[PDB]
């Protein structure tokens, strides 16, 4: 874990379009994402 | 009608200079060589051109130490 050379990394809140809530961490300076196709949206993931 | 070769260099007189059981002074050089064909042993040092010399007075004796031919100087007893 170096001093400051790595890109900024903070906890982030990810909300799905179909209503799933992901509690994660990313390099997003905002820390907030909403996604319309997720693990419960794709026809291949949930068979729909 | 001419040979494109015919050159050679001087012989460097390499080889073992003191053999086993031979009493030497401290500092005598004992074997002249190119690589490390004989590795420095106990109380024997190695020179810049890989020349083995004696770091103490005694008798020369060769050995093998983990698959390496080595040269050692053995302290003869003082009369």
């Amino acid at each position: 874990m170096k001093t400051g050379i790595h890109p900024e990394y903070v906890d982030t809140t990810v909300q799905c379009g179909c209503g799933h809530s992901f509690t994660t961490r990313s390099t997003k300076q905002s820390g907030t994402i909403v996604v319309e196709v997720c693990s419960q949206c794709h026809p291949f993931y949930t068979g729909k | 009608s001419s040979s494109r070769n015919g050159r050679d260099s001087a012989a460097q007189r390499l080889g073992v200079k003191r053999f086993g059981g031979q009493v030497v002074k401290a500092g005598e050089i004992l074997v002249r060589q190119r690589g490390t064909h004989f590795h420095p042993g106990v109380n024997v040092g190695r020179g810049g051109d890989d020349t083995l010399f004696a770091l103490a007075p005694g008798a020369v004796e060769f050995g093998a130490k983990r698959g390496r031919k080595t040269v050692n100087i053995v302290p003869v007893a003082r009369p």
């Binding site: 050379i5 790595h6 890109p7 990394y9 990810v14 992901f22 509690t23 994660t24 961490r25 990313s26 390099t27 997003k28 994402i33 996604v35 196709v37 997720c38 693990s39 949206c41 794709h42 291949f44 993931y45 | -």
Partner: protein, 182 residues
């Protein structure tokens, strides 16, 4: 006081799953995932040395760590490639950055595939070290679309303690990896 969630679910249910359906004498023989390696093998940078910059930037934003620049340790006449030329960039992820990156990929980025049809189950190197590629860096939402300059594929490797593809595949499925069903 805080842990990644997917590692939590792993320990909670996948460990018992792997134990009870693979039946190890030692509870420590229950396998698991060890590391992931993302490699952008750029290679064509033998002329454009400036493309590796976008390579390392986008890979850093997705992975959260700054790649080591991988040079070329051979001299070859064809590709205009000399020794010591930056050719690729790699990051290894272990631990919390490990699990969080796996989240960002499989729950987010891997859904973002256009024309997705799964990932082949025969993609193991004999012992369960699963390695797959792709050809577009625009399935990662960490990067905006127009902000890209060239279409680039990553190189995603998951290295696990499988003894063979059975442990590797059982693990990857148990972790929630949408394979191709052959």
């Amino acid at each position: 006081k805080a842990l990644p969630r997917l590692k939590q679910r792993y320990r909670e249910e996948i460990r018992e799953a792997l134990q009870q359906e693979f039946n190890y004498a030692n509870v420590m023989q229950i396998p698991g995932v060890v590391k992931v390696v993302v490699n952008m093998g750029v290679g064509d940078a033998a002329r454009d040395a400036k493309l590796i910059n976008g390579a390392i930037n986008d890979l850093a934003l997705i992975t959260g760590q700054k790649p080591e620049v991988r040079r070329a340790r051979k001299s070859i006449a064809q590709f205009k490639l000399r020794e010591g030329m930056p050719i690729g960039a790699r990051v290894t992820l272990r631990g919390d950055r490990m699990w969080e990156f796996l989240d960002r990929l499989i729950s987010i980025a891997l859904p973002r595939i256009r024309d997705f049809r799964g990932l082949s189950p025969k993609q193991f190197d004999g012992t369960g070290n699963y390695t797959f590629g792709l050809n577009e860096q625009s399935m990662f939402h960490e990067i905006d679309v127009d902000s890209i300059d060239r279409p680039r594929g990553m190189d995603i490797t998951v290295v696990t303690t499988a003894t063979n593809d059975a442990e590797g595949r059982a693990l990857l499925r148990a972790l929630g990896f949408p394979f191709k069903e052959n």
